Ligand binder design. Structure first.
Ligand SMILES: Nc1ccn([C@@H]2O[C@H](COP(=O)(O)OP(=O)(O)O)[C@@H](O)[C@H]2O)c(=O)n1
Length: 126
């Protein structure tokens, strides 16, 4: 399968979530930001690159967070915890960014695939 990596950026005990702007099916819904691994890249290479491109921040990539998600027959979606080395995140690509605490994770308007990670995200914040 092709891998899509996503980052759980936790700063000051809150989590960064990112509101998609495209495609139409997911626009307005919220996700862990990331994107597709390209040939030759490690998971950490790809995820750091994507979060530089998408958020303008330099992160260190940490442990896995929650289960792999089988997006479709081609693609596997994997989250990693990341931590902010430097920068403040800005939405280059996304409609909006938000910092959420444990009390907001369950109720958030997630993109379907990411919902699997809700307990794992609540735990990471607590
Ligand atoms: N946290 C995320 C990130 C991507 N995805 C899915 O993974 C696919 C690839 O993600 P993407 O479009 O952000 O990838 P790039 O265009 O950033 O490389 C998309 O179709 C998303 O629906 C997801 O379900 N959850």
């Amino acid at each position: 399968k092709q891998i899509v990596v996503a980052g759980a950026l936790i700063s000051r005990g809150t989590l960064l979530v990112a509101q998609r702007d495209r495609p139409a099916e997911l626009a307005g819904l919220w996700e862990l930001p990331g994107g597709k691994v390209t040939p030759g890249e490690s998971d950490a290479d790809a995820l750091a690159r994507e979060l530089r491109e998408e958020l303008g921040v330099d992160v260190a990539v940490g442990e896995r967070l929650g289960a792999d998600v089988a997006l479709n027959d081609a693609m596997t979606l994997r989250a990693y915890r990341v931590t902010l080395r430097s920068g403040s995140p800005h939405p280059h690509d996304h409609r909006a960014l938000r910092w959420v605490g444990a009390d907001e994770i369950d109720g958030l308007a997630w993109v379907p695939a990411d919902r699997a990670w809700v307990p794992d995200l609540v735990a990471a914040l607590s």
